[PDB]
Design a protein around this ligand. Structure first.
Ligand code: A1BB6
Ligand code: GG5
Ligand code: NA
Length: 336
């Protein structure tokens, strides 16, 4: 049942992966973990192998490890990164302390291609359509990405895009900047608008230096909140700030994004609305005339129900670790 593992040291960390994965070369490391590119001999595809860093060192870490595994196992969509394999070199639960995730290898992210080439309107259409297509799938399972940004959008040479990890502040919705605890899925739509504006102009839309400067840059373009939006702010300390600034009017998006496709400008206006209740959804954005060449209602599927009840649970270290263990053995690979 269990395959054969081989041990090797890459960078300053260790890797114990099955024999089917060969030629492990590092791609990029961080606080999340170490990612290696490998060749899968069972399928012939190039894969990305991610070793989690300290998966069960604290309650926050153990729950986070369980959350990522449950999330990656549920995502089955062409525009969302999915799990090709999940393994551990441990034979029992007692020695279980390392988790490895395997997925399709993507050569670059949207950050590596935005400044390398100012994208044409046709390429922006295809890239943003793929984001919204994957966002409709994610949002249909009551999941919010919360951290959409160019580095979180993997693209290959074929212009095919996938969402990952479902300055960062440059793409954050203003309701999160104001610490509103009841934001909805439309915070991701705000990030898409910031990303789509960057691809069209080649510039970061809101390159704020801090949480304060970020809001001033946003309010400079979309204007200060009106009376309808002000009625929805319960935090008196929040209103003590917004109602105290110099009131900014909403700028003409056709003038700010001059020379761009008028259909692209119209979509940005519906995406970059201050009031989150009036922001366009992912499903509505797919039907926008900007994506007429790509929109297909019968090929924009939704996700199966996702059980998020674990998020409101207070468990111990071994309990989160044992639940993560169960998800490893119960994994079923996707069909070839
Ligand atoms: C902001 N993010 C940048 C990329 N992140 C990534 C990228 C990958 C990946 C997937 C497929 N092909 C290559 C690499 C993985 Cl597996 N994990 N995190 C790490 C954090
Ligand atoms: F300046 C702003 C910027 C954003 C908002 C906002 N948009 N949608 C929801 C909110 C919001 C922000 C803070 N508290 C409640 C609601 C309100 C005022
Ligand atoms: Na992965």
């Amino acid at each position: 049942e269990r395959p054969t593992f081989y041990r090797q040291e890459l960078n300053k960390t260790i890797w114990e992966v099955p024999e089917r994965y060969q030629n492990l070369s590092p791609v990029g490391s961080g606080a999340y973990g170490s990612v290696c590119a490998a060749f899968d001999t069972k399928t012939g595809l190039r894969v990305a192998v991610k070793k989690l860093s300290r998966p069960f060192q604290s309650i926050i870490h153990a729950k986070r490890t369980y959350r990522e595994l449950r999330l990656l196992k549920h995502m089955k969509h062409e525009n969302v990164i999915g799990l090709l394999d999940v393994f551990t070199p441990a034979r029992s639960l007692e020695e279980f302390n390392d988790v490895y995730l395997v997925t399709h290898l993507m050569g670059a992210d949207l950050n590596n291609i935005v400044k390398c080439q100012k994208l044409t309107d046709d390429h922006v259409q295809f890239l943003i359509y793929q984001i919204l297509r994957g966002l409709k799938y994610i949002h249909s399972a009551d999941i919010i990405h919360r951290d959409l940004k160019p580095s979180n959008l993997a693209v290959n040479e074929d212009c095919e895009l996938k969402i990952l990890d479902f300055a960062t502040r440059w793409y954050r919705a203003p309701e999160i900047m104001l610490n509103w605890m009841h934001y909805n899925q439309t915070v991701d739509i705000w990030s898409v608008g910031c990303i789509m504006a960057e691809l069209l102009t080649g510039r970061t839309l809101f390159p704020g230096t801090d949480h304060i400067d970020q809001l001033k840059l946003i309010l400079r373009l979309v204007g200060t909140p009106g009376a309808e939006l002000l009625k929805k702010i319960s935090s008196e300390s929040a209103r003590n700030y917004i109602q105290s600034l110099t009131q900014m009017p909403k700028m003409n998006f056709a003038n700010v994004f001059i020379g761009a496709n008028p259909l692209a400008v119209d979509l940005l206006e519906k995406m970059l609305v201050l009031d989150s209740d009036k922001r366009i959804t992912a499903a509505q954005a797919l039907a926008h005339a900007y994506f007429a060449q790509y929109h297909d209602p019968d090929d924009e599927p939704v996700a199966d129900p996702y059980d998020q009840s674990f998020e409101s649970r207070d468990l111990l270290i071994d309990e989160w670790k044992s639940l993560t263990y169960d998800e490893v053995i119960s994994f079923v690979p996707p069909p070839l």
